[PDB]
Every structure is written in C-alpha cells, then in structure tokens.
C-alpha cells in the first residue's frame, strides 16, 4: 500500500497480574468521513492471542486472512494443534514482524500498526508491537497512533514499571482501558463511541467483549462556555 484509504485509529493495551487487555474502536474512516461503524479491529487467534490492528482497513483484512491461514496450516498433521503444539502469541508475532519488515523492504508496506496480545503456554503475558516499518517493541502498555499520545500516559499511571504488573488486577486494568477509550473519544476526531475489548487471562482464557459504548461523559460545563474572549451571552 502506497497510501491508506479506509482507516482505523488507536489500538490500546496493557498487562495486568494474570494476563493482558486490548481494545480498539469499531470505526473505519475514509478521510474525514466517518464511513463504517461495525468494523472489528481485534483479531483473536486461537484461545490465547488477540491481534489488534490500526491503519489501512484493506491491509487489515489481508492480515486477518494471513492469520486464519496460519491457524489452518498449523493444524495439518498436528495431533496436538489444540494443545502443546497450538500457536503461541510469540509465533504469531514473529511471523507478522517478519512479514511487515519484508513488505517495508520491498517498498510496498502493509500500512498498519499492530499490537499482539496474549498469554504464552508458561503463563507469561505477551505484549508486543509491530508497524509498517517493521519497527517492534514491548512495554507494559502499548498504544498505536493517537492512543500512543493520550492512552499511554494514562495507562502508565497504573503500570509504570515491571513490578506494577503483579499488583494490577483485571478489574483495575479494565477500568484504566475504558477510561482511556473515553478520553480518546473526547479528543481524537477520528474516534467512535463504540468499541471492542478483549482480555486474555492465564486462568479464564479469552473474554471478547463486543459493542461497548463510551459512557459517563462530562459535557455539562459546556453550557457556560460562551464566545471566545469578550462575548458575555
């Protein structure tokens, strides 16, 4: 892709004591037109991974298909495909990272930023980022695009350093995530009020929540804001 057409904004995510949380709104924009509103940008791979994608939606759909194909292929002649020899988040990540860097290097990027979230077989949280340049990093929180600028600073107040992770519960992390989603709705002109959230827990497995709405907003004070300086009424 030489330039993006239909696009998804921020994907955001954080680790907590027993797993990871990831969220992304359900909008596919078309320039400044808020064109499509039921676009799922979180992609579960098996029971242990959720791949969240921002950027060009055509490229996102292409990646979705690559992932389903992995699942299919991995199962061939694999008696333990649902067990010991299932796909690990780390395998899904390494594959995508390989693909993104290859496409960057052929001057034909997949025009996306991607976060891969899950839990490894030994119970370890997995959270790692890759984008259209093939750039990769991990951190206790990750966010793409606009969310990197406003969600990260919010989320880091919860998990600021590695040691904060075991002190953090799903309940607390999920609240942090949702609040960040509300803040993005306030200040990102390409955000939607509707979003999906997924939790991947070493004990409870994958929990995929569709159709969340940003709630509990403050608009009250707006009645008192008049003019832009001197105007009194």
């Amino acid at each position: 892709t030489q330039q993006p057409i239909v696009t998804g904004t921020s994907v955001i995510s954080m680790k907590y004591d027993n797993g990871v949380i990831i969220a992304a709104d359900n909008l596919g924009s078309y320039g400044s037109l808020l064109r499509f509103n039921g676009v799922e940008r979180l992609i579960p791979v098996g029971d242990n991974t959720v791949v969240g994608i921002s950027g060009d939606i055509s490229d996102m759909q292409h990646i979705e298909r690559l992932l389903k194909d992995l699942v299919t292929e991995n199962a061939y002649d694999n008696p333990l495909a649902d067990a010991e020899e299932a796909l690990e988040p780390s395998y899904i990540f390494e594959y995508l990272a390989t693909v993104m860097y290859q496409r960057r290097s052929k001057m034909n990027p997949l025009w996306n930023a991607i976060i891969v979230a899950g839990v490894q077989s030994n119970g370890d949280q997995f959270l790692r980022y890759v984008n259209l340049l093939g750039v990769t990093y991990s951190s206790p929180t990750l966010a793409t695009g606009f969310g990197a600028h406003m969600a990260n600073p919010l989320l880091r107040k919860v998990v600021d350093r590695e040691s904060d992770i075991p002190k953090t519960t799903v309940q607390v992390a999920e609240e942090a995530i949702v609040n960040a989603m509300r803040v993005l709705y306030y200040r990102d002109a390409r955000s939607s009020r509707n979003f999906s959230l997924a939790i991947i827990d070493k004990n409870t497995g994958l929990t995929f929540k569709k159709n969340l709405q940003v709630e509990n907003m403050k608009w009250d004070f707006a009645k008192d804001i008049k003019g832009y300086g001197t105007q009194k009424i």
Binding site: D77, N78, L80, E84, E85, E88, S90, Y91, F93, E94, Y95, T98, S121
Partner: protein, 234 residues
Amino acid sequence: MFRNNYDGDTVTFSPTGRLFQVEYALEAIKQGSVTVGLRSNTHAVLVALKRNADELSSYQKKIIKCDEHMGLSLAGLAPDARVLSNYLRQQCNYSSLVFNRKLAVERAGHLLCDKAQKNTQSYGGRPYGVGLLIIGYDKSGAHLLEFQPSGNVTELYGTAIGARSQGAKTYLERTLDTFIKIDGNPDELIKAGVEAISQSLRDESLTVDNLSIAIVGKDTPFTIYDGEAVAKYI
C-alpha cells in the same frame, strides 16, 4: 530375470506394483555400518559404529547435529546424508527465524518424507540411498524417527539400521520395556544403546576410535560424543 525389465528407473512399476529402484535404494543402507537409536521419556540417544579405510585413515562421522534440539545418524550414501541433513538444518532454521519456533521432530520427519518422495516419482534423479535415525526433544517430549529411501518416516521407541543391524534391533525389541523407562538418567540410556549396538558386532570391538554417541533431552541440547568422550561407556 524378469525384474531386469522393470528396474531401470524410479518411474516404472513392475507388474506386481513394485518400484525396484526404491527397493534397491533400501539395499544401499546395508552397505553402511550399523547405527542405533533409542529413547525414554526424557532423553533420546544415538549410537554409531564408524568405519576407517585402513590404519592410516580417520573414521567417518555418522552423526550430524541439525539444531539445538535435533540431530541424526546415517547409514548408506554419505553424500545423500549430507544433502538431507543440510535440508533439515535449513528447515529448523526457517522455523526459528520466521516463527521463533523450534521445528517439531514430527514435522521435520514430514518435510523429509515429502522431499525424498519427489525423487521417487519423477524421471531424472534417483531415490536417496541412505537411512536416517532422527532424535529430538520438542514440546511433546523425546522422539525417535526412522527415515527410509521411499520417503516413509516412522516414529519408534528404538531401532537399528545398516550392516548387521538385526542383532541390535532384536535386542531393542527384547529390552523395550526397560530402556523406555530410563528417565533422568542419561548415562544409563547411553549404556543401553552401546549394549544394543554391541549385538551387531562381528569379530570387532568398540573403541575410542570407532564409537560415536549422541544425546538430546529435557534441558539437554543435542551433543555428540567421540574420542575420549566415549571411553566411560566402553
């Protein structure tokens, strides 16, 4: 006499549906010297007898590491073994670079099978005339595979291939109940292996010069013992 008309290439069935070129390839293995593989639940072990050309020469390697958790032993055409083990090294490596994933031994066997098969169905080349015993340790534990020139790969507790290998293979059947339980005790699994390969000796003895041993397992990367490294077992 009749076989003579149908055995010219690997692309010809005999009237009873044999491929003699593949059957002949099997015979190439018997020209090699014996090698044994065996395993428990924690380790997998190879034992090979190496040949020299005379007293002035070195002994030929029989064991090849393919990755940290996988390697093989060979009997038959040495060049074939070089080609097929390099291929395995590449497949292991590919699995690591692209997927950050150790290639399962079962998947290694399948890839090996498909490659060898192609040589048996097209005109131009020949089947691989070498036998491979493949050991490994992956997420599903310890494994031993036997590779045949036909491409067919079989998962076994133990086996032997090469010249006079029947003795070891009989010994491994006979001792099956015992060696598969040797867990957390690598030297003991090795001793079982040396004992097995010994059944295949004809007026010849295992020395620091001719005996090669390999082991892999839980917390144990694929390691090859030769020379003075094998003395404790002799």
